[model samples]
Target: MKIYDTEGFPNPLRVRIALAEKGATDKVVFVPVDVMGGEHRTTDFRAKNPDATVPVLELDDGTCIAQCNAITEYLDGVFDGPSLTGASPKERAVIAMMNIRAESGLMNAVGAYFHHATRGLGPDLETWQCPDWGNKQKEVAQSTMAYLNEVLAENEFLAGDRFTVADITAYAGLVFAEFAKVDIPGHLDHLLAWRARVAARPSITGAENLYFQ
Candidate 1:
């Protein structure tokens, strides 16, 4: 299989973590797309993905999977590795619910603020930026951290005691929050402890450093 992605990007990082967990990272060829250079918006990439995003996973048989969730889901069951998604139907549903909550509540909110409130990729890409709108999303992202902190206070992991894609999604989002200039409150010790544990993982550390490259 071939994987198309960009370094330091959240979606690609998420997919990469899943691949690493599956012990399939070396099995697939990695292709870098010039996302900052607008290569993803070109007719070429759009042909593979109408959404024109990085982290498109192409199966050896030529099946193309786009989006972080879709790619991670496919990778989770394809290889003979410990399942990072879930083990049962009920577990998948719960993990998926928590995953989407983290994504929409925190990740997407940070994304909007990055694209709209800040200079973003630059004037060429961020054609329209509304500071008011972006700041609103910033507030949302900050507040949602508290919500996740509350959840972590009870459950060892987002879905339960097991680590799942929900944890991966949130981990990546909170890590990127530094670049977004959205600070996680210092008082949320539960969240901070959770972050430390997740960050210490070899796969998570490797994926996070991909941003610097």
Candidate 2:
């Protein structure tokens, strides 16, 4: 199998972390797709993924899998290691819920602000910027951070006490916040501490600043 990773993308790093956690890094090939070069938008790449997103896992039989959560879902089902998604039926649902919240409430919010509020990437890439709405999204990201901080205060990980996909998702969101220059509020000590603990995982610390290209 080949995992199509894009340089300088958060979603790709999430997949990398998942691969490491699932002990499948050596099982698949990591193909770097140059998003900055507009390679992801090409017909050849779009053929593999109609959405033109990176970090697509192409199976040996030609099934191309996109989306971090979906890719991890299959990996969790197949791999022999600690499950990153969940262990039980209820656990699975909770982890999925928390993962979606982190992705949408935090990560996606940060992305919106980055593309709209700032000059993000370059002209051709960030043509739909709306400063007013972007500023609003920035507030949304901050608001979600506060909510997450409260959540973290009660649990070691986003989904609960276990280090599941929700942790990975939230970690990716925090990394995106750095690139977006969205400061984590000082009062959110739990959130900051949780980030520190999450970074200590080899799956994350091993990559260092490579989270961005």
Candidate 3:
């Protein structure tokens, strides 16, 4: 199997973290895409992923899977290690719920602020402008941080004690938030502590410039 990705990007880092957590980081081949060069939008790359997203997982049999969550799901299922998704049906549902919350409320919100409100990916790549909506999303990201802080006050991880994909998504969101200059209030002590703990994980500690291109 091969992973088509741009290193240091948030979405790509998600899959990389999943692979490391599974102890399967060396199992697959990594094919770096020149995203800044508009390589991902090319017809050739689009053949593999219509969405033109990074960190696409391409199976040996020519099967290409896009979307960070979907890629994480595939990795969690096939890899021999502690599960990142979950085991039981109820556990899976809960993890899924938390994962989506982190994704939409934090990850995507920070992303919108970066790409729309700020000068992200250069003028060529960020063709559309919506500073108003982008600033609103920044507010959304801050509120989500407050919500997650409350959740962390009770649990060790996003979806209870054990670390799961929800943790990965939320951690990546914070990383992106830092890069985008979205202030994470110091008063959110639980969230800050959780971030410190999550930062020490072997999977995350191994990666460099997680929010940089």
Candidate 4:
């Protein structure tokens, strides 16, 4: 399999971490995308991913998969490791619910703030800007931090005892939030603690360094 992505980007980080957790990072080839140069928007790249997003998974059979969630599902199932999605139907439902919450409320919210309010990727890529909506989404990101902190107060992980895709989504969101300068708030102690715990995981430790480079 192959992964086409821009290193250090928030969404790509999610899939990279997932690959590490599955112990399949070395089994795949990584194709770097010159996102800053607008290579992702080109015709050839669009054929692989119409979304024109990073971290696209291309299987050996030529099946291209986009979206971090879908890529994660493929990795978690194909690789030998503890399941990241879930083992049972009820568990899958809970994990899916929490994952969406983290993705929309925190990850995408910070992304909006970065691309809209701030000069994300410079003017060439960020053609459409909406500072008002971006600022509003920043508010959503902060509130989501509080909610996740509350959830962490009761459970060790986002969806429950075991770390799931929900945790991965939220962790990546926090990473983006920090990069986008969307404050997580000092009062969210549980969230902070959870972040620290997740950061120490072997999978995270392996993939985290690429985020800043």
Could you say which candidate leads in lDDT? 3
Give a tens-digit lDDT track for model 1, residues 1-213: 999999888888888887877888898899999887888899978888899888999888877889999998888988876777788899888999999988988888898888898877888777688989988999989988999999999988888898889998998888778788899999998889998998888777633543422
Tell me each candidate's RMSD, in Å, in order. Answer: 1.7, 1.5, 1.2, 1.6
Model 4 misplacement above 4 A: 206-213
Q: In model 3, how large is the Cα lDDT of residue 201?
A: 92
TM-score for candidate 4, residues paired by index:
0.96
User: What are the lDDT figures for the candidates, one per model?
Assistant: 0.85, 0.86, 0.93, 0.91
TM-score of structure candidate 1: 0.94
- On residues 1-213, what C-alpha lDDT tens digit does candidate 3 reach at each position? 899999879999888989999999999999999898899999999999999889899999999999999999999999877889999999999999999999999999999999999998889899898999899999999999999999999999999989999999999999999888999999999999999988889998734575434
Worst 10 residues of 3 by lDDT: 204-213
lDDT of 3 at 62: 99
How well does candidate 3 score on lDDT at residue 7? Answer: 82
Runs in model 3 lying further than 4 Å from the true structure: 211-213
What is the Cα-based lDDT of residue 79 in candidate 3? 86
Clash pairs for candidate 1? 8-211
What ranking emerges by TM-score with the best candidate at the front? 3, 4, 2, 1
lDDT of 4 by residue, 158-203 (tens): 9999999999999999988877888889999999999999998988
**Model 3 reaches what TM-score against the true structure?**
0.97
Number of the predicted model whose TM-score against the real structure is largest? 3
